[PDB]
Design an enzyme around this catalytic site. Sequence first.
Site, PDB file in Angstrom:
ATOM      1  CB  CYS A  14      44.106  32.663  37.785  1.00  0.00           C
ATOM      2  SG  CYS A  14      42.776  33.815  38.069  1.00  0.00           S
ATOM      3  CB  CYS A  49      43.803  34.130  40.978  1.00  0.00           C
ATOM      4  SG  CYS A  49      42.362  33.419  40.098  1.00  0.00           S
TER       5      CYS A  49
END
Lengths: 103, 103
Positions: free
Chosen positions: A29, A32
């Site tokens: 991600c 992230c």
Amino acid sequence: PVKHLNSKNFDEFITKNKIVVVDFWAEWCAPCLILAPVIEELANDYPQVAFGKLNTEESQDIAMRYGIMSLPTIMFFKNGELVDQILGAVPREEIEVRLKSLL
Amino acid sequence: PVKHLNSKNFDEFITKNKIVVVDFWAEWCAPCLILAPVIEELANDYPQVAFGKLNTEESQDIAMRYGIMSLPTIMFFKNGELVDQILGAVPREEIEVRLKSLL
């Protein structure tokens, strides 16, 4: 200052600590990975809050229990209870304004 | 009828097949797991469309390249190009209306 949380220690972390931030993330991600340094620096500045990171792939049972789906998910706990969340990368100011309200 | 995609075969899949649906999912994602049977039955009914599933943890480079963050992500490709997407679980009707438009 950011704890690496797992299935075994998660509950303890949000129970023993009054004000908690949990960063729910995954290795694939990008937002992230981008957000991680900002979480780290926030943990530095706010030692009165316990910060933890929960790798969804590593602790799938915690991810599922909370119905995690949109990453990063930054969850805010007070007295073991989920009281706020942010879905997706946001500015540091977004996290900091929500932190200050909880304090 | 749903292909299991990986880093090596992804491009080929969306190149050789004119109309493609890709289900980006993760093992810890409840709406993902919930949606899988409906993707399977849609693949059954629409053999004129190639359906594939991409496990984000397994093929992290594909996940990152597309900036995947909100699961499930159902992506619609035509001629190798991303032309539509759905973020999060939606009814079968949501997927089917978008499929029929592309056909």
